[PDB]
Design a protein around this ligand. Sequence first.
Ligand SMILES: CCOC(=O)c1c(C)n[nH]c1C
Ligand SMILES: [Cl-]
Ligand SMILES: [Cl-]
Ligand SMILES: [Cl-]
Length: 163
Amino acid sequence: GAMAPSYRVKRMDIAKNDEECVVNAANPRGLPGDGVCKAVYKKWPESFKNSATPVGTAKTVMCGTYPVIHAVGPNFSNYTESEGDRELAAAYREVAKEVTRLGVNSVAIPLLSTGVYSGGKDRLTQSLNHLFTAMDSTDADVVIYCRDKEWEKKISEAIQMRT
Ligand SMILES: CCOC(=O)c1c(C)n[nH]c1C
Ligand SMILES: [Cl-]
Ligand SMILES: [Cl-]
Ligand SMILES: [Cl-]
């Protein structure tokens, strides 16, 4: 575990993370996809061997010795708000299990279902709170990656609020 487990946020490409493993915002079919998933495919293409996994689950595939945790959030275009919320909470609990199993001291994580899977809604608070519910009981250093300047400020404030 980390000596004093923390949460941090950075506004940059998760493909350039400085952590011991990465969470992919994956699709269920293990396809190259777009956004985070496409950046992860360009950086760690070997990790997409048999990465396909259902919605609400996480599957780890090694790229050399570097773990890529493929986490499949719901597409809120397809799910009801209620069922989507349940599957989004579940994807993050499966990430917490994988981070713990791997014995890493740090993990880079994006906000699941906040991009093309958002169903055109702002889900920053919804996705971040599910991330906290899952990861609070882990002792890894968590580093959240985002691209928007306003999102960085909002995630930073939400972290600082609990400290
Ligand atoms: C805004 C959509 O892109 C991303 O979120 C993103 C991150 C984080 N890393 N790489 C990409 C393309
Ligand atoms: Cl960058
Ligand atoms: Cl998304
Ligand atoms: Cl963002």
